[PDB]
Amino acid sequence: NVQSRGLDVAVRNANDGISIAQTAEGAMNETTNILQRMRDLSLQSANGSNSKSE
Amino acid sequence: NVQSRGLDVAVRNANDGISIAQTAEGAMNETTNILQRMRDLSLQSANGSNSKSE
Known part of the structure; x- marks a missing residue:
């Protein structure tokens, strides 16, 4: 459950780094x-x- | 009779230990x-x- 939550946050963090690269x-x-x-x-x-x- | 009463108390003490550990x-x-x-x-x-x- 800790890994599952950490993977939810990790996907959010990869998306944020996707956005900074996009902008x-x-x-x-x-x-x-x-x-x-x-x-x-x-x-x-x-x-x-x-x-x-x- | 002494062991029967002491066993009744013993179940009460075991249940109280269950209560504290549960809380x-x-x-x-x-x-x-x-x-x-x-x-x-x-x-x-x-x-x-x-x-x-x-």
Whole structure:
């Protein structure tokens, strides 16, 4: 009965660690989207056609 | 006749010993339930998702 209760808590604890990993990965999702946008703007800005104003 | 009376008293003393042992065990029944709950809380607190507040 002590092990059964401890396994109930253990499943709750694995779910909580699942949630922290989920929330973090979701935040990294927008970090990837933002970084890719910077990369496209960097390629565009490297073109020789561009002047200094743009 | 003396042994018959002393045996009647002996059953009374055996029953009183049963009563005391029974009560002491009923109290230890709740000591077990309280300790098991304390163990569930400790397992939950050992999780890393918790902050100092929890």
